[model samples]
Target: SDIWFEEKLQEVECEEQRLRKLHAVVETLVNHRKELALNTAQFAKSLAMLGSSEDNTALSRALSQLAEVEEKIEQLHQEQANNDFFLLAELLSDYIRLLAIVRAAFDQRMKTWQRWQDAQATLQKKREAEARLLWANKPDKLQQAKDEILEWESRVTQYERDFERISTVVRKEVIRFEKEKSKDFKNHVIKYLETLLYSQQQLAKYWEA
Candidate 1:
C-alpha cells in the first residue's frame, strides 16, 4: 500500500507541476492579447482623430471605417482575453491547489504507516522477552511479561487498523478528486471551444462588412 501510494503521489505531483507551467503559459498569452488590444485601441483613436479633421475625402471616410472596425476588434479581443483567463487559467490554478491537498493527505497517511511499524517492532521485542521468560521458569515475572506482551499486541492491532482505515480513505478521496477534475476539464474545453469559435466568427463578420 505504501509503495502504491508513493508512486501515485509522485505522479500526481508531477502533473501538478505541469499544470502550474501551463497556467503560466496561459497568463503569458492573455497578457500578450491585452497588450495587443491596448495597441489596437491607441491606433484606432489616433486614426479617428485624423479622420474627423477632414470634412470631404474618400481617404478620410476609409480611415474612419477602419478605426471603427479596429476598435470593435479590440473590444472583442479583450472579451476573449477575459474568457481565456477565467475559463482555462483559473481552472488550472484551482486543480493545482487540489493536487497539493491530495499530497498533504498522502503525507498524513505515511505518518500513520510509520506509527504502525513502530508498534509492530515493539511487539517483536516483547515476544522475544516472553520467549526468554519461559526458560527462566519464574511465574511472577512470566505473568508480567505476558501482560506486557498483550498490551503491546493490542497497541499494534489498533495502529494496524487505523493505518488500514486511512489507506481506504485516501484511495476513495483520490478517486473522487480525479473524477471531478476530469469533469471540470471537459467542460472547460467545450466552453473554450465555443468562445473561440464565436470570437473568430465575429472577427470575420467585422472584416467582411
Candidate 2:
C-alpha cells in the first residue's frame, strides 16, 4: 500500500513539472506578441511622420521601409497568434493530466483505506468471539485477551495517523504547485502587456525625433 501511494505521488509530481514547462512556453509566446506590437506601431508612426514632410526622396524611402515593416509585422503577428493558440491547447492538456493524476491517487488511497478498515473489523470480531469462549472456561485468559484488544486498538490508531499524514501531504503539495504555476502565468501576461505599451510609446518618440 505504501508503494502504491508513492507511485501515485510521483505521478502528481511529474505532472507539476510538465505544467510549469507549458507555462514557460506560453509566457515566451506572450512576450513575442509584445515585441511585434511595438515594432508595428513604430513603423506606422515613422510612415506618418515621413508623410508630413513633403521631401520626396526621404519620404519615398521611408514609405518603402514602412511597407516592409508592416508586412513583416503582420506575418509575425499571425505566426505568434497561432503559436499562442497552440500553447493554450497544451495548457489545457496539462491541466487535464494533472486532474486525472490527483483523482486517481485519491481513489486509490480511499480503496486501500477501506480494505484496511474491513480487515481490522474482521480481526476485532474474531477476537471478541475468542474472548467470550475463554471467559466461559479459563477466566485468567480474559485479562490477556483484553490486553490483546488494546494492542490492536493502538495499531489501528497508528494506521489512522499515518494515513492522515500522507493524505495531507499529497493534497497540499498538489494544490500549492498549481497555485504557483497559475500566478507565474498571470505575471508573464502582465509583463508582456506593459512591455507592449512602453514599446508603443518609444515608437511615438522615435517618429517625433
Candidate 3:
C-alpha cells in the first residue's frame, strides 16, 4: 500500500480534523478577548462616573486617572486580540486551504498514472495481435499489425513520459511547499509570541506605574 500516498492523504485529514478545529478555537478565543476588553472599558466608565460624583478633589482626581489607566489596558487587550487573529488564526486558515490544493496536485498525478497504465495495457494487446499475424503467415495483414504495434508503442512511451513528468513535478512541488510552509508557520508563531510578550510587558508597566 503506497505509504507516500497514504501519508499525504492522512496529512490532509489531520489538518482538516485537528488544525482546522484549532483555528476555530483561536478565532473563538480572539473574539472572547475582544469582549473582555469591552467589559473592561465598561468597568472603567463606571469608575469615571463614580469619580465625577465624588466630593473630594484628590480622590476624584485619583479615580479619574485610574479609569484612564484601565482604558489603556483595554486598548492593549484589543490590540493583542487583533494580532492573535491575524498572525495565528488566519495563518492556520491559509494552510488549511493550501492542503486542499496539495490534494488536487496529488489527484493529477494519480490520473496520469491511470493513463500510463491504460496505454501499457493497450500496447500489450497490440503485441499479441502482431504475434497472431506472424503465426498466420499473412504478409500484408502482418504489416498492418506491426504498424498498429508501433503506434501503441509510441503511445505507451508518451504516457510513461507524461507520468514521470507529473511525478517529478509533484515531488518538487511538495519539497518547496513544505519549506515555505514551515518558514511561514515559524515566522507567524514567533511574531504572535512577540506580540503577546510586548503586550504583557506594557501591562506590567501600566500596573507598576
TM values, all candidates: 0.63, 0.41, 0.62
TM-score of 2: 0.41
lDDT of 2 at 21: 69
Q: Between prediction 1 and prediction 2, which has the larger lDDT?
A: 1
Separately for all candidates shown, the number of backbone clashes (residues 3 or more apart, or on different chains) is 0, 0, 0
Give the higher-TM-score candidate: 2 or 3: 3
Candidate 3: residue 176 Cα off by (Å): 4.2
| Predicted candidate 3 versus true structure: per-residue lDDT over 39-100, tens digit per residue | 89998999899999999999999989999999999988877666644556666767777766
Please identify model 3 stretches exceeding 4 Å from their true place: 1-6, 30-74, 82-85, 180-209
The TM-score of candidate 1 is: 0.63
Residue 142's lDDT within candidate 3 is 88
Q: Give the per-residue lDDT digits (tens) of candidate 1, residues 1-209.
A: 56888888877887777667766766676667778999999999999999999777998999999999999999888776777445666667677788887888888888999999998998999889888889778898999999998999889999999989988888986896686466445455556657767978998999996
Model 2 over residues 1-209: C-alpha lDDT tens digits?
45755675676666556665666766576566667777776877777666656578877777867767786776767665665454554555556566566766576567657756865896688587675767487656676776777777777777677667657766665675465346444454556557767978999999997
lDDT of each structure?
0.80, 0.65, 0.76
TM-score of 3: 0.62
Pick the lDDT winner: 1
Residue 63 alpha-carbon offset, candidate 2, angstroms: 28
